[PDB]
Amino acid sequence: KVCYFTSNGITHIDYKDVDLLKKFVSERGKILPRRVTGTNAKYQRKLTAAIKRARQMALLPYVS
Amino acid sequence: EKMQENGTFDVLPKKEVVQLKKELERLEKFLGGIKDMKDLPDALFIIDPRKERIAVAEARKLNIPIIGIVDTNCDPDEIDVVIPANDDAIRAVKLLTSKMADAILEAKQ
Amino acid sequence: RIDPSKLELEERLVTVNRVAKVVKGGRRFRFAALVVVGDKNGHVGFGTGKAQEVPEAIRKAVEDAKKNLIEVPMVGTTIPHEIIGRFGAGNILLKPASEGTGVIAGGPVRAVLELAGVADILSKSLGSNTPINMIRATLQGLSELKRAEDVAKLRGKSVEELLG
RNA sequence: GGUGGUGCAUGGUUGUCGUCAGCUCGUGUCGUGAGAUGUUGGGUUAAGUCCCGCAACGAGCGCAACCCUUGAUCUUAGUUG
RNA sequence: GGGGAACUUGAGUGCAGAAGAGGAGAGUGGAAUUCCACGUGUAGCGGUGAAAUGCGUAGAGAUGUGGAGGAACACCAGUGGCGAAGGCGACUCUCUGGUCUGUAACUGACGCUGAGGAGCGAAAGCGUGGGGAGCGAACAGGAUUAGAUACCCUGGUAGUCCACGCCGUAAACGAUGAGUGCUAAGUGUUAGGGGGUUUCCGCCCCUUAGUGCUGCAGCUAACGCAUUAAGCACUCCGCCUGGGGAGUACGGUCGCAAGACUGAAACUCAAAGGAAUUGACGGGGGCCCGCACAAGCGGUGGAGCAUGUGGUUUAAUUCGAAG
């Protein structure tokens, strides 16, 4: 598919961008996989670097 | 073929159908118009040895210089005469076989 | 090139192996054969021999023998130089010598060199003692021989310059 | 002369796997060689039956068939029927 | 080989980048297991091939909130990252190792390998305390079975877990000792860099580095291996010389011990193993067949009697046939 980040060409996720993150989160709260989203390896490793932190600030759910 | 028109054609009406004419449909296809050979020839023309290395092997194995249009992935170690062209252009495979058939046509004198 | 069948082949056998195969009932004993075939003027070859009998395997050895021959240089009834063949775990080296030295070779190998006409070879079967591969150890080395006038033509050089 | 001995000296003779769908050869190649291909793959059949595909093309012993019986009818022949 | 002097590609340094589950430290959460407090609520749940032991009218199991406590860190997860190997996956911070690119600024061969020596090295085990929710050797119980000191079954001690000290072994595996160059491709994939139209996105091409697969020459005994070599060459270190006896005994070091490392011999077989092929078998799979089985009918094994071999019995019970 198409990388969502390279469509913007965008750097650092800036963790408060919850609605930008919620596109990459599944229905119940799990992490959407790489091959469905079609991101990049540099970007996919920043996602779990970001998504896990917003889980610890209650901005992203664990299991909903 | 001597039997079906000149020989004993009247044995059964279906011995020829099950066996003889079923043989006639096979060998006129699968042994075709090379049938009047009676000799070991000294040349061969093919279209794709990369598709059909199998035919080239025994021709190579008896030291026979052969010709052929080849694809770019073919074997120049194998063939003595390299002809690089489109393997599936219907005009070009008619064109290149026209020059070679007219080569031996003028060489009949 | 391919050596033609317009020669005088002498074709004495080397060994016979009885060779089995195990079916529902029991074994099936057939025979194997290999015959060194050639003249005494520089053309040596062989073929395999497979049948269900003794003598028809001797027949079918001659076919692939006449399908596969090879030629050896006979400089002074010697091999022209020294070489070591290495085909398939049987090493057999080849050394030239003077003309009185006879044919000192292994069992099956002695039935090869006399079927070259070349009567001056020292050799020693380094590798295994198996009859097919020792003959494969000979002709593969004999294939890699060279002639004195040929390599001077390869180098673009004088033939006598290879000697002096 | 032995119906004396050994069917692990034998011919011959039959059972048996089972009337099961199999066993090989010739040529060609394949693999240093043993062997492998043909016989495997696809579709069927009671079946190596048969078609298609197929580095194999073929042939041989098998299967079936031609042999009998019973099941219909005609010709010829009708007694002891 | 030695000495004297230069060059910069080998290797190193600067500088500019980029990747990271690399290590060590103190702290932080989120589901989930159990435990316990209690509401609500009734006869069972629990477990298996089947079933029992265990748990339960004293109120279990299920369910609702709340509480303690440990250890494990889903999703991302990928022949994906990194380390020399063992290994490391929640999160953040502090501290710290190397890696790769970009050149050129610098050094002027400063390098490679390395016996002994040194340090690291999963799991088990050891010594001292800490902590012990799951899990769990030993043992116990219930089955299973001719036997069950086993697989199953409910519990269950050490352990695992932490700090610190030691043992220093494994299929510690890529069954491939480390480095340098060279030798068709095609192909993904992780990190870059250069360019070509383009801010782009992108496509295409060139290019370093690990990372996988299919492949030529050649190597190979065959399977296979193939720019990450088992190709062709070279420098260095370890190891093997038939199998068992045996990694045993003895002798010595080391350790808190368990045992590790160095390491035999008398004896004895003519062979033990390597890949490969045809077979036969499989309480391995796939297709498929016969009264084989299922769905039925009628008998045999009880009863007398005929008959046939057994054994036994006799003067001999003629000999042969034995799933």
Coordinates of N, CA and C in Angstrom, one line a residue, chain A residues 13-48:
Chain A
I13 N 6.8 12.0 15.8 CA 5.3 11.8 15.9 C 4.6 12.8 16.8
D14 N 5.3 13.4 17.8 CA 4.8 14.4 18.7 C 3.6 14.0 19.4
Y15 N 3.9 13.1 20.4 CA 3.0 12.1 21.0 C 1.6 12.5 21.3
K16 N 1.3 13.8 21.5 CA 0.0 14.3 21.8 C -0.9 14.2 20.5
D17 N -0.4 13.8 19.4 CA -1.2 13.7 18.2 C -1.9 12.3 18.2
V18 N -3.0 12.3 19.1 CA -3.7 11.1 19.4 C -4.5 10.6 18.2
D19 N -5.2 11.6 17.5 CA -6.0 11.3 16.3 C -5.1 10.8 15.2
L20 N -3.8 11.3 15.1 CA -2.9 10.7 14.2 C -2.5 9.3 14.6
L21 N -2.4 9.1 15.9 CA -2.1 7.7 16.4 C -3.2 6.7 16.2
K22 N -4.5 7.2 16.4 CA -5.6 6.4 16.5 C -5.9 5.7 15.1
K23 N -5.4 6.3 14.0 CA -5.5 5.6 12.7 C -4.7 4.3 12.7
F24 N -3.6 4.2 13.5 CA -2.7 3.1 13.6 C -3.1 2.1 14.7
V25 N -4.2 2.4 15.4 CA -4.6 1.5 16.5 C -5.9 0.8 16.1
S26 N -6.0 -0.5 16.5 CA -7.2 -1.3 16.1 C -8.4 -0.9 16.8
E27 N -9.5 -1.7 16.7 CA -10.7 -1.4 17.4 C -10.6 -1.5 18.9
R28 N -10.2 -2.7 19.4 CA -10.2 -2.9 20.8 C -9.0 -2.2 21.5
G29 N -8.0 -1.8 20.7 CA -6.9 -1.0 21.2 C -5.5 -1.5 20.9
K30 N -5.4 -2.7 20.2 CA -4.2 -3.3 19.8 C -3.5 -2.6 18.7
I31 N -2.2 -2.9 18.6 CA -1.4 -2.3 17.5 C -1.7 -2.9 16.2
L32 N -2.1 -2.1 15.2 CA -2.3 -2.6 13.9 C -1.0 -3.0 13.3
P33 N -0.9 -4.1 12.5 CA 0.3 -4.7 12.1 C 0.9 -3.8 10.9
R34 N 2.2 -4.2 10.6 CA 2.9 -3.4 9.6 C 2.4 -3.6 8.2
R35 N 2.2 -4.9 7.8 CA 1.9 -5.3 6.4 C 0.5 -4.8 6.0
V36 N -0.4 -4.6 7.0 CA -1.7 -4.1 6.6 C -1.6 -2.6 6.4
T37 N -1.0 -1.9 7.4 CA -0.8 -0.5 7.2 C 0.2 -0.1 6.1
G38 N 1.2 -0.9 6.0 CA 2.2 -0.6 5.0 C 3.1 0.6 5.3
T39 N 3.7 0.6 6.5 CA 4.5 1.7 6.9 C 6.0 1.4 6.6
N40 N 6.9 2.2 7.1 CA 8.3 1.9 6.9 C 8.9 1.4 8.3
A41 N 10.0 0.7 8.2 CA 10.7 0.1 9.3 C 11.2 1.1 10.3
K42 N 11.7 2.2 9.8 CA 12.1 3.3 10.7 C 10.8 4.0 11.3
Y43 N 9.7 4.0 10.6 CA 8.5 4.6 11.1 C 7.8 3.6 12.0
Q44 N 7.7 2.3 11.7 CA 7.0 1.4 12.5 C 7.7 1.2 13.9
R45 N 9.0 1.4 13.9 CA 9.6 1.3 15.2 C 9.4 2.5 16.1
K46 N 9.2 3.6 15.4 CA 8.8 4.8 16.2 C 7.3 4.8 16.7
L47 N 6.5 4.0 16.0 CA 5.1 3.9 16.4 C 5.0 3.2 17.8
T48 N 5.6 2.1 17.9 CA 5.6 1.4 19.2 C 6.5 2.2 20.2

